[PDB]
Design a protein around this ligand. Structure first.
Ligand SMILES: Nc1nc(OCC2CCCCC2)c2[nH]c(-c3cccc(S(N)(=O)=O)c3)nc2n1
Lengths: 260, 299
């Protein structure tokens, strides 16, 4: 399977890094023309894009991070929001994917709203703004690490944790407030207990240092989001997780209870 | 933008950009510039540049080449690295007659392993270790270079790019076409480089995919599910492989003592999980006396 020599150092490093590549929390409030709503729209659209080209979730997890970061220091008009979106994704794909889609492809998927030079120039601007700091931790990196503590590793929980993290990305507030490791922390446990009833493992407390007490504020926010899933205007993410690939996990009923 | 720098000569290529030797006119710093074009095929900023830059910023270590600046021009992109005396290849080539002094090898290998464990702990796989990509100074240190092929990995690793490494230093699992490769691959390479510093000739001078694999088998023996649990249900594995018997190591590495060949052996285990880590290798008894010799030039 693997030689797991560096799990500890690696986990350590991503915890150190996730602090540094963290976007600014109330940034949308500063932004003259864009709203949390607009951003949800953007993320949702990014999600279909990922499906159409069979892209990694990791790819879009990075993409999202790149946007929040970029929009943290660069004022942008709604007219141009989608383009920041597309360049972000192209960079992500470039960094992560084995076979990233051609520049051509990306221009295609924009309603032909923007030219190619537009997209390529934006690509460059984003790199300038992020100062080439693209190697960022995401929720997925944490989950995938966390998943190793599971015996026997259970498909449904995994596909549900992945699903939940993704949901968080649609919502700026409240989720910009939480570090990826905590978003992962929450989703994992929330999945685990919807599916097997079982508990955030003692094992992970020892690795992460997180207790259920320490995760509670997040979980409260996350539960209601799962609850009101079918009323949110963003639907693509749900539809994605209905397939035989992901064991139709969006169709389950969220738990009544958490013992509050 | 470059009005500060004076090109002296081209030093080489690797075909990805070109590499010039520059001096700062103001400070007199001597640097290695790596020039990169972007208006290649209207395909944006190249992947092999994006990854190198972003990971080399994350990586600061004494045995990993220093990236000093990155200069943004509209059509070119210059990377400024620290400048070193030569690469291990042309030094072995020079030292070819005498052969490499015994403890200078031990030193270099030790340092190289310090560097690789840094990479691995920052979730970076190098993937193109070879004497051309390892630079030495005059001060007796050696640095890893050319992270053009490197990539950041996940834990556990996903399926990553197949066409990797250089063939002479390529590991079995990749030759055999496996769906998941890990840290193990870099170690294999460093293994072959260790052997090459010692014997004076490359370990597996293969001419093709199949030829490379057999060259390995003919030394280390063809493997079975004992030596390598999983080998037989791998993607490009073929039951009609010849059955070569493994051979004696003092026959393979004649100048090595018991310890060195103990070490080397573990760096070359068919099984990736079994293959020694960079970390674990650092604690190996062979490094007991490790000191820091200085090489002769006359350049
Ligand atoms: N920073 C840096 N990188 C180098 O290599 C970059 C290339 C490594 C191989 C793959 C392409 C990038 C260098 N090469 C030399 C250097 C200095 C003196 C002599 C020589 S050599 N090869 O013996 O003519 C190389 N100094 C160097 N300094």
């Amino acid at each position: 399977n693997e030689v797991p020599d560096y799990h500890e150092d690696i986990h350590t490093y991503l915890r150190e890094m996730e602090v540094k590549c963290k976007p600014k929390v109330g940034y949308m409030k500063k932004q003259p023309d864009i709203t949390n709503s607009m951003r949800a729209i953007l993320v949702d659209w990014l999600v279909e894009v990922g499906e159409e080209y069979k892209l990694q979730n990791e790819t879009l997890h990075l993409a999202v991070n790149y946007i929040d970061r970029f929009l943290s220091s660069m004022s942008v008009l709604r007219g141009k929001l989608q383009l920041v979106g597309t360049a972000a994704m192209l960079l992500a794909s470039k960094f992560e994917e084995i076979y990233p889609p051609e520049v051509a492809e990306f221009v295609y998927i924009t309603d032909d709203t923007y030219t190619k030079k537009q997209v390529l120039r934006m690509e460059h601007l984003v790199l300038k703004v992020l100062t080439f700091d693209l190697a960022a931790p995401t929720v997925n990196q944490f989950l995938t690490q966390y998943f190793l503590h599971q015996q026997p590793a259970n498909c449904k929980v995994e596909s549900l944790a992945m699903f939940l993290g993704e949901l968080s990305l649609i919502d700026a507030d409240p989720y910009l407030k939480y570090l990826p490791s905590v978003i992962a922390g929450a989703a994992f446990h929330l999945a685990l207990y919807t599916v097997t009833g079982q508990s955030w493992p003692e094992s992970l407390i020892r690795k992460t240092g997180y207790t259920l007490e320490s995760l509670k504020p997040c979980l409260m926010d996350l539960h209601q989001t799962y609850l009101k899933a079918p009323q949110h205007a963003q639907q693509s993410i749900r539809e994605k997780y209905k397939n035989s690939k992901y064991h139709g996990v969006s169709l389950l009923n969220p738990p009544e209870t958490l013992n509050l | 933008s470059m009005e500060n720098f004076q090109k002296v000569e081209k030093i080489g290529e690797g075909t990805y950009g070109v590499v010039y030797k520059a001096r700062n006119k103001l400070t007199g710093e001597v640097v290695a510039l790596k020039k990169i074009r972007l208006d290649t095929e209207t395909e944006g900023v190249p992947s092999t540049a994006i990854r190198e830059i972003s990971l080399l910023k994350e990586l600061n270590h004494p045995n990993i080449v220093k990236l000093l600046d990155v200069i943004h021009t509209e059509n070119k992109l210059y990377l400024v690295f620290e400048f070193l005396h030569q690469d291990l290849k042309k030094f072995m080539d020079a030292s070819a007659l005498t052969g490499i002094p015994l403890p200078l090898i031990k030193s270099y290998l030790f340092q190289l392993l310090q560097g690789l464990a840094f990479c691995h702990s920052h979730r970076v796989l190098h993937r193109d270790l070879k004497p051309q990509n390892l630079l030495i100074n005059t001060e007796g240190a050696i640095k890893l270079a050319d992270f053009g092929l490197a990539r950041a990995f996940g834990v556990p690793v996903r399926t990553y790019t197949h066409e990797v490494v250089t063939l002479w230093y390529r590991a079995p699992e990749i030759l055999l076409g496996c769906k998941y490769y890990s840290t193990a691959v870099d170690i294999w390479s460093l293994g072959c480089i260790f052997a090459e510093m010692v014997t004076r000739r490359a370990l597996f001078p293969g001419d093709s995919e199949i030829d490379q694999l057999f060259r390995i088998f003919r030394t280390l023996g063809t493997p079975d599910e004992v030596v390598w649990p999983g080998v037989t249900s791998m993607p490009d594995y073929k039951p009609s492989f010849p059955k070569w018997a493994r051979q004696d190591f003092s026959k393979v590495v004649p100048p090595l003592d018991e310890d060195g060949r103990s070490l080397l052996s573990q760096m070359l285990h068919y099984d990736p999980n079994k293959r020694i880590s960079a970390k674990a290798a650092l604690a190996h008894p062979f490094f007991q006396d490790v000191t820091k010799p200085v090489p002769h030039l006359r350049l």
